[PDB]
Curated annotation (Swiss-Prot):
Disulfide bonds join 3-23, 17-40, 42-53, 54-59. Belongs to the three-finger toxin family. Short-chain subfamily. Type I alpha-neurotoxin sub-subfamily. The keyword Signal applies. It is found in: Secreted. Expressed by the venom gland. One of its GO terms (molecular function) is toxin activity. It comes from Naja atra (Chinese cobra). GO terms for cellular component: extracellular region. Binds to muscle nicotinic acetylcholine receptor (nAChR) and inhibit acetylcholine from binding to the receptor, thereby impairing neuromuscular transmission. Produces peripheral paralysis by blocking neuromuscular transmission at the postsynaptic site. Has a lower toxicity than cobrotoxin. This is Cobrotoxin-b.
Amino acid sequence: LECHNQQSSQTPTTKTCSGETNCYKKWWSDHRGTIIERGCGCPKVKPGVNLNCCTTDRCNN
């Protein structure tokens, strides 16, 4: 499984997961705007955060 792992609006990059069967994208905002974290897996998140856990290559851009 290949997942995107770049932060926020940075140039897209991906990593090849080592076992995970999900990719994730989590985002929320602060005074500067939207912050986005991407990677392998499907982590538990703090309430109030947006989260997308998907199951296909590069599905979390």
